[PDB]
Symmetry: C5
Subunit: 254 residues, 5 copies
Amino acid sequence: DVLAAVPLSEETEFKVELFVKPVIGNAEGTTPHYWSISSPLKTAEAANVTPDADTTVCYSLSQVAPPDIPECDMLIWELYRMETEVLVLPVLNAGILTTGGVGGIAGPQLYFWAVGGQPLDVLGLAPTEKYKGPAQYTVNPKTNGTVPHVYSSSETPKARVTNEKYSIESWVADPSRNDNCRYFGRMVGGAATPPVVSFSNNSTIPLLDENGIGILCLQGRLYITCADLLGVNKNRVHTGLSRFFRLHFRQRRV
Amino acid sequence: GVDVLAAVPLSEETEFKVELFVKPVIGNAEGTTPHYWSISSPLKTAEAANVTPDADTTVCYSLSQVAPPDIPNSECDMLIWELYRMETEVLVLPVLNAGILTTGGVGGIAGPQLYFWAVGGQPLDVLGLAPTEKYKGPAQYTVNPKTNGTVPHVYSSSETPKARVTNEKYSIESWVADPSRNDNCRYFGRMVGGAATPPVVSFSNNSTIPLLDENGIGILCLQGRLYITCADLLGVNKNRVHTGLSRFFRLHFRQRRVRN
Amino acid sequence: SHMGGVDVLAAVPLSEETEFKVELFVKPVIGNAEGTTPHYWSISSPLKTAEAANVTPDADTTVCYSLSQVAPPDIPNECDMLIWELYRMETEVLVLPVLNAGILTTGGVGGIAGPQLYFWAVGGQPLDVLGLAPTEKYKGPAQYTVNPKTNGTVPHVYSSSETPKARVTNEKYSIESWVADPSRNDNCRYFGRMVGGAATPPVVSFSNNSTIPLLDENGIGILCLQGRLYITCADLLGVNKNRVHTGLSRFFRLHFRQRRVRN
Amino acid sequence: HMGGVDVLAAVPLSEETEFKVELFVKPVIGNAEGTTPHYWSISSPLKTAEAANVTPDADTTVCYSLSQVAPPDIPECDMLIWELYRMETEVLVLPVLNAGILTTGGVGGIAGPQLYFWAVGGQPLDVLGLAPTEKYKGPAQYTVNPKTNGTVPHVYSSSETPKARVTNEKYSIESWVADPSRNDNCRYFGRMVGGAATPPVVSFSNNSTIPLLDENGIGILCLQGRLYITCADLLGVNKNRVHTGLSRFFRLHFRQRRVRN
Amino acid sequence: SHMGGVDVLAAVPLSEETEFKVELFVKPVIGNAEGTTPHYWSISSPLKTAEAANVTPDADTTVCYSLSQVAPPDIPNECDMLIWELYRMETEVLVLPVLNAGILTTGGVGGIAGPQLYFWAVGGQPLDVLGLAPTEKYKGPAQYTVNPKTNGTVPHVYSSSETPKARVTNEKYSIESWVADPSRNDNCRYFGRMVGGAATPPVVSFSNNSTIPLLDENGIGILCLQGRLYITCADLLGVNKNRVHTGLSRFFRLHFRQRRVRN
Ligand SMILES: [Cl-]
Ligand SMILES: [Cl-]
Ligand SMILES: [Cl-]
Ligand SMILES: [Cl-]
Ligand SMILES: [Cl-]
Ligand code: NA
Ligand code: NA
Ligand code: NA
Ligand code: NA
Ligand code: NA
């Protein structure tokens, strides 16, 4: 039950800047690789069903907990405004390939970010009838099998991104669940097309819904979840170097 | 030409909401039930595909039906459910590793695309056309414009078949939405050519579609049902047809007065 | 010229008796290799090779401006004159995805791709056009089409003296040598986009919920001074398997009202 | 360039104070043996690297088209002057399909590097002379090169970057750029494209205006009685030949304006 | 940071005595294989092959951030200062079409295409940047440039401890390993777009009639706290005939006014 927002004063508002690292899976271990660049992609036979954990990208996950607050009404932190910019280099010389000429980053892309008062809700799906995912580090939809390539009430697994072990290659954001959350995604096909990426210093995102309510930190935490798959360069998967976030909080009665 | 009166002021008792997923439909080569697949069987070669592609190498319009709670009915003024607002988002994965092809490198999804959705108080009205002078369609599962022949590749008053999407057997490769018929319906489509271009697909959590026409009237469920019809052909990957994994819908209803 | 010396007065307030609506489809036109009647085809015959195509392509390997004519009901008419005025229209193109019909014998999926031309025009008279040549040797079909110069070439540039000025009165005008005249089309609204030819795909949107207003700076639509409205259009989508494709057919919903004019 | 002039009230527009002209402007290809311009939409075949990279034949390059308009004459203390406040401009263009079929087989079209540009002014367009590379000279024939038998820098130089005004049809779009530091009493507009064989996309209509008033509601002032149109529409390459727009249309809308003597 | 601990008051109402304007050009910078002075080139030396380029490309095969500095006239005449404030600017890039200079020896028209990077920044201090590596082995030129690590590699990811934080004080910063810091650039407005590398063409617009406003949420532009304004930019257009091209040069028109500040 959402009541009036506390009029914002120096005592009622909170700001944080932070960077979020991209996540590549781990071929022999359980800690995430904070890499912008993956290990070489395996060949069809392997990649099509069981790609090495370090040839896939996972949702990065970051958690923010603003200062503690000092009845029948309760005061809660509300995210109402944010800036987010991705760190990115041009690959030119690092793009020169042994054949000769300039390959670059190109191919399939996935840009996504999410802010919420809880973990991001996702759905487990398969691209094809035989894709399993890494047999190693990642939480697959089915740990040694395949889930359908279509929505199933009974068989489509419903998970929450609580760790950095969720491959963007088999987990989609759930459009039927993500309350108290704003999320945003674009994906691209794969006839070797270039990523186009803009970045500025002068660009805000408002977060208020139809009723002027932002994201409510009901449990004291805010959940950031994101991924910026840029494509492939020299048979290696590239992501954004890292993503910046400036979060603007105020207090709200509940 | 029915008689639309005032919308009932929306209260907790007069409004209705549903969330649902719609599955993509691939045709059935050895059967009559639809395949709920995001990925098809391998495409046949020119000689076959150009005239009679296997039913499981084509995409069909998905069809879903919603019937909101009964309205306990003045033998003069009726109450009708009215769809005035909706959200729709498509579920989609990036194909990277599943995109690696045997020759080496990263193929992806690319090629011809077709995005389409429709909401209505009746089935979607369509027109039967042929891409070329010899395209028949699957000789198997689908309702073809002409069951063992070809219809013209042009609009004909006499020869262009006019059907309504009442089942999941209508191939997007020979059925187009009828711009001269779809009253009490809002529909929307984009198609792409085929020099192996990538699909670009956005999805969000914060995006609405208003459905009111010039007179502020949404879609009226005159028979108590709302008809959803859609297709999201994403292109081809490794000689196989891909669609969106599934499409989400949140429907917003209110009640509206109509005269007999 | 077309609107010259016409004196436009108040629009008649629109009532059930003063307004008129029509829906219609317009068929694409491919030229005719051994005839004079138009081929209503969305798909052409196979393209000839350079030597032929570059100068004299077979009439059935080119697209012509489709032409359709609408005449609203008679008006029971002093110094004033009621006249039909087109003020609003919807137009949508019928289009299929070519996937299986796109599979080519070499293997894989060719599609429609290459040079494109989208165009439509509404007017109270035929569309005014200018005859030009893409190159120094393009003549056009020696068969069915009205060429800028029957067995020669016209310049590849605007010439006051040598650039032919015609009006699209029939379905014999090839989009490959006739351009809309920007210096003539009064009492007419027209619209065109063309694409180059490094095999790029057509992108085509269609809806149910999209209008075009037709009123000019003075709030005057298209006036049917002779009782007829002239529709002129072409939707060249590109090439698939060495064959020219167009839109299947184009839909039109025309909205008319009455308007006062001096004699 | 504009300073010194003192702009007063615009004369309220009546049938006696306003002027309109429609006109076409022809594209210009250079002349391999001659000093008159070729009014061509299509050039002669492009030379090979060794030649083209440094000294391309004059008829393998595009030059800025130039057209001049002088409205009717006008008759004490302060002057009446013609002011361009509104214009329409549309390019004439064909689809190349059959003329696009190439001897190898299939449909080549127009594709490659593009340059769209137009300018309206009360004086010639001010340009800057630059070189794409360290060895590009330009045609040794018809064109005014930045340096008639040498190269100018591939970068702005206060001392070495030549500053000219487009007074004739001899200026190659391949070595002359509009000067962003000079063009007062002028509105100009340009887009260029790179060269991995990409197609031109070109729109044309009947129902599209360009307003020309600046921040102070002042259009282009014809201080010397003439208006200067300058333009170029490089569409790309088809069958090893350079194509431009067929011709560009212009409808110019003039009114009168007061200026202190 | 750069702003925090400053107290901004009313802008001085702009009169002929309180406002200042400058026009200037900024030259592109290619690195120097043998020297320490920058090469003001729009075109680089031929790109090295993978083995070299991937880790240690020759300084003259990379682009560096151009840097330009503007210092407006001194302000004459306690408890508060007058300061110069940039509130408006125009910026346009000088660019040629490469057609004939694009013809390549194998035949046909190559052009400029491939990876692109457009960027500009205005500030009251140097632009803050972060040192990152594209890959696990990229070092940069062993010659002219300030590398993130002068003989080694820095991470390909943000590290609080290991990601170097520098300020662009000279023309020795390679756009191939230095990114603008989104967590630092107060009293600065910056803007960038990058493109991937499947040989895609640059598309570049330029006009005469296009402004950029610079006021923030509170209507405050860029404040020249030390009397200088810092311009920093780069326009990597792509590659033509195995050579790196940039914009020829970038124009700037800067609009200043005066503003009150507490000491
Ligand atoms: Cl189910
Ligand atoms: Cl018929
Ligand atoms: Cl003449
Ligand atoms: Cl200098
Ligand atoms: Cl850290
Ligand atoms: Na941005
Ligand atoms: Na969306
Ligand atoms: Na539309
Ligand atoms: Na236009
Ligand atoms: Na601009």
